[PDB]
């Protein structure tokens, strides 16, 4: 149910935002941009050193407030406790950016069922848990979920099966939740971010002698995600290219869903 | 260039506007809307008797001027001169609604080059003369050009082949000048209007024994043409089974041109 305005940094001033996987990469960048914009901000990841740093820049950059809570999203207790603790810290919640992911490498699949389950737990199941926990507050602010996904979450890829599965799962889970929200008269927006290669310490570390693509700036990536969510869009596409950024849209799907939109009109 | 704005009937009034093939069906309706919204309206067609019917109903509906001219658009001399005459009769021009077509019926194309030629003359070539004559005045007003087309102008259908050819012609031509303008700083607006079956007499006689879904009303259609016309949209769809309205769109093509530009 996209917005009908144009983005302005002020849409975020005074907004209370959680960003996860917020200690390096895109997550960091989002915190900073929300900082420049004068938002309350709660950030998270496992290492508390690195998080402190981020919290510093954020306060220097302009945040109405800025905290951090360290912990693994491997553990679901923390996930549901983090949310309750963070909505306390800022006194309520406007947007929830689900961004974190478990350490992955590019490698062929030969029997790593530990990695597959782990991907599923951290990259997918935690999202749902956090969303469950944030939903009450989100309702009462008419906030917004943002979810960060990938090419590999829309099309297949050899080096990253466990990761793809997890990303694909988000699409299916949240898109199918997005429907429920419409009919539910639930006024919380769900934005899915599909990204091509992005220049992160980590991404490069894992691709820099295998993949040939040009990667996009982490800084701009982050802003497009904040905006997409601010403008309550359904998908955000971002890739150095524009060939790609136009293909991942799948209108067959737009249709079929529109069609099957009226195979039922019952509660 | 798009516009996320919204349509109020007031975007019109005071606007200088031509409506071709107004003597019947959708043309009549477009004008009757422009009259119930009151702009300057010069209206063409051949039938002089019916082009009077229309010219007066428009006054008694609130047009800030109604006049007719009566000729056959087969005549490229006439066409160029109609747009002069109407240019004078109005002191400028904002919106040109190319709509006229030529007598067709469903028929399996055997060997009738004649119908193919007339179709290209009246349905494609003339609209091109109308435009070229109109272009100075529309430059001076940052106006809009509205081209009316059809399903048969996007995808193949049997039985209307002369037709489709002239319709497809309109797309290649106008979408291609459209681009010429943008990458040029020329602020003229070109709308292609892709319309499924509509409920009009000459269009009902023709499709007689063809299992169509109900033709959507000439009125909202006419309105739709005018709306997106005014809204300066690149293209405008409209079909009764609004189903179609979805996949009639061709996203595949959008991608291509973006890159070549
Ligand atoms: N960069 C790209 O080319 C690209 C392309 C498509 C999609 N994406 C998506 O963008 C998002 C972020 O990616 P990125 O490139 O910024 O990667 P990144 O730099 O490696 O982000 C890692 C973040 O997640 C945290 N994290 C890792 N394991 C965790 C765990 N078990 N529990 C809680 N937090 C954990 C890390 O913190 P700690 O390790 O300190 O806990 C760090 O804050 C991901 O959703 C990714 O799929 C990126
Ligand atoms: N009706 C549909 O089912 C439908 C569906 C798809 C597309 N369309 C499109 O809608 C547009 C208008 O269709 P319509 O249904 O409104 O058609 P229509 O009812 O037959 O009207 C045709 C108009 O064109 C005029 N005309 C015929 N020959 C002419 C000529 N040689 N020079 C100048 N004007 C001439 C007629 O006036 P005179 O007889 O007085 O000359 C009449 O005003 C066309 O582009 C058509 O392709 C309609
Ligand atoms: C988490 C990780 O950083 C990652 C980055 C990028 C994507 S991607 O789906 O966007 C992507 C984009 C472009 C291309 C190309 N050529 C390939 C991919 C798959 C990955 F190699 C997936 C995952 C990594 F590298 F696996 F560790
Ligand atoms: C000019 C005319 O009125 C006309 C109307 C409709 C279209 S159409 O291409 O848009 C169309 C629309 C719906 C369906 C369906 N079912 C079929 C068609 C093709 C026609 F057989 C083409 C032309 C006619 F019929 F030829 F006189």
Nearest ligand to the CA of A205 is 3
C-alpha–C-alpha distance, residues A248 and A9, integer Å: 28
Among A68, A127, A157, A163, the active-site one is: A163
With beta carbons less than 8 A apart as the criterion, state whether A227 and A33 touch.
no
- Is the sign of the CA dihedral B5, B151, A255, A265 positive or negative? positive
With beta carbons less than 8 A apart as the criterion, state whether A183 and A138 touch.
no
∠ CA A188-A227-B8, rounded to 5°: 80
Q: Which residue has the tokens 């005045």?
A: B137
C-alpha–C-alpha distance, residues B186 and B97, integer Å: 19
Nearest residue (CA) to ligand 1, atom 14: A25
C-alpha–C-alpha distance, residues A100 and A27, integer Å: 8
C-alpha–C-alpha distance, residues A217 and A114, integer Å: 32
Instruction: Please give the DSSP secondary-structure letter assigned to residue A145.
Output: E
User: Binding site residues of B for substrate, as ranges?
Assistant: 150
CA-nearest of B227, B233, B261, B260 to B249 is: B233
Q: Write the DSSP assignment of B83-116 as a string of letters.
A: HHHHHHTTTS-SEEEE-----------SS-HHHH
Chain A: residue whose CA lies nearest to B244 = A255
C-alpha–C-alpha distance, residues B182 and A176, integer Å: 40
Q: In which element (H, E) is residue A95 found?
A: strand A95-98
Question: Using a 6 Å cutoff on CB, does residue B228 contact ligand 2?
Answer: no
∠ CA A121-A126-A129, rounded to 5°: 130
With beta carbons less than 8 A apart as the criterion, state whether B225 and A241 touch.
no
C-alpha–C-alpha distance, residues B67 and B70, integer Å: 10
B258/A246 touch (CB, cutoff 8 Å), yes or no: yes
The enclosing domain of B254 has a CATH number of 3.40.50.720
B259/A251 touch (CB, cutoff 8 Å), yes or no: no
HSE at residue A118, side-chain half, CA atoms within 13 A, is 9
User: B-side interface with A, Cβ within 8 Å?
Assistant: 4, 243, 246-247, 249, 251, 254-255, 258-259
Chain A: residue whose CA lies nearest to B250 = A251
Residues of A in contact with B249 (CB under 8 A): 251
CA-nearest of B97, B32, B21 to B62 is: B32
Instruction: Provide the H-helix boundaries in B89-217.
Output: 113-119, 126-141, 161-182, 201-207
A26 marked as part of a ligand binding site: yes
Cβ neighbourhood burial of A49 (10 Å; 0-12, 13-18, 19+): exposed
C-alpha–C-alpha distance, residues A113 and B85, integer Å: 80
A35 marked as part of a ligand binding site: yes
C-alpha–C-alpha distance, residues A227 and B154, integer Å: 36
Question: Using a 6 Å cutoff on CB, does residue B55 contact ligand 4?
Answer: no
Count structural domains, chain A: 1
B259/A242 touch (CB, cutoff 8 Å), yes or no: yes
Question: Using a 6 Å cutoff on CB, does residue B198 contact ligand 2?
Answer: yes
Question: Using a 6 Å cutoff on CB, does residue A28 contact ligand 1?
Answer: no
CA-nearest of A9, A88, A89 to A55 is: A89
Take residue B256 and report the two structure tokens written for it. 């291509």
Q: Which residue has the tokens 């769900």?
A: A190
Structure obtained using: X-ray
C-alpha–C-alpha distance, residues A11 and A14, integer Å: 9
Give the β-pairing of B40-45 and B95-98: unpaired
Strands lying side by side in the sheet with B235-238:
B66-70, B40-45, B16-19, B95-98, B144-150, B189-195, B235-238
- Determine the 3-state secondary structure of B49 from DSSP: coil
Resolution (Å) of this entry: 2.6
- For A256, B66, B78, B141, B180, the CA distances from B134, given in Å and listed in that order, are 43, 19, 14, 11, 17
CA-nearest of B69, B78, B188 to B135 is: B188
Residues of B in contact with A259 (CB under 8 A): 243
| Rama region for B232: left / alpha / beta (φ>0; ψ in -120 to 50; rest) | left
With beta carbons less than 8 A apart as the criterion, state whether B41 and B34 touch.
yes
With beta carbons less than 8 A apart as the criterion, state whether A69 and A85 touch.
yes
Residues of B in contact with A245 (CB under 8 A): none
Residues of A in contact with B258 (CB under 8 A): 242, 246
C-alpha–C-alpha distance, residues B111 and B108, integer Å: 9
With beta carbons less than 8 A apart as the criterion, state whether B31 and B43 touch.
yes
Question: Using a 6 Å cutoff on CB, does residue B154 contact ligand 2?
Answer: no
Q: In which element (H, E) is residue A194 found?
A: strand A189-195
CA-nearest of A246, A20, A220 to B255 is: A246
Note the maximum CA span of chain A.
Answer: 54
A259/B247 touch (CB, cutoff 8 Å), yes or no: no
Range of the domain at B56: 1-261
Query: Residue A199: which residues within 8 A CB-CB, separation 6 or more?
Result: A215, A216, A217, A218
């Amino acid at each position: 149910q996209p917005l009908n305005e144009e983005f302005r940094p002020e849409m975020l001033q005074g907004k209370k935002v959680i960003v996860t996987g917020a200690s390096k990469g895109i997550g960091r960048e989002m915190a900073y941009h929300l900082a420049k914009m004068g938002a309350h901000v709660v950030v998270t990841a496992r290492s508390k050193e690195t998080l402190q740093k981020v919290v510093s820049h954020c306060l220097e950059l302009g945040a109405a407030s800025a905290h951090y809570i360290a912990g693994t999203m491997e553990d679901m207790t923390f996930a549901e406790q983090f949310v309750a603790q963070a909505g306390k810290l800022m006194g309520g919640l406007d947007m929830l950016i689900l961004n974190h992911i478990t350490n992955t490498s590019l490698n062929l699949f030969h029997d790593d069922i530990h990695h597959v389950r782990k991907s599923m737990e951290v990259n997918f199941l935690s999202y749902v848990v956090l969303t469950v926990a944030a939903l009450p507050m989100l309702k009462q602010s008419n906030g917004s979920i943002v979810v960060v996904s990938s090419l590999a979450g829309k099309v297949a890829y050899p080096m990253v099966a466990a990761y793809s599965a997890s990303k694909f799962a988000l699409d299916g889970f949240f898109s199918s939740i997005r429907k429920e929200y419409s009919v539910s008269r639930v006024n919380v927006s769900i934005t899915l971010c599909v990204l091509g290669l992005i220049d992160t310490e980590t991404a490069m570390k894992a691709v820099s002698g295998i993949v040939h693509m040009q990667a996009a700036p982490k800084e701009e990536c982050a802003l497009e995600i904040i905006k997409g969510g601010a403008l309550r869009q359904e998908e955000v596409y971002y890739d150095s290219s524009l060939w790609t950024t136009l293909l991942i849209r799948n209108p067959s799907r737009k249709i079929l869903e529109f069609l099957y939109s009226t195979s039922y009109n019952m509660d």
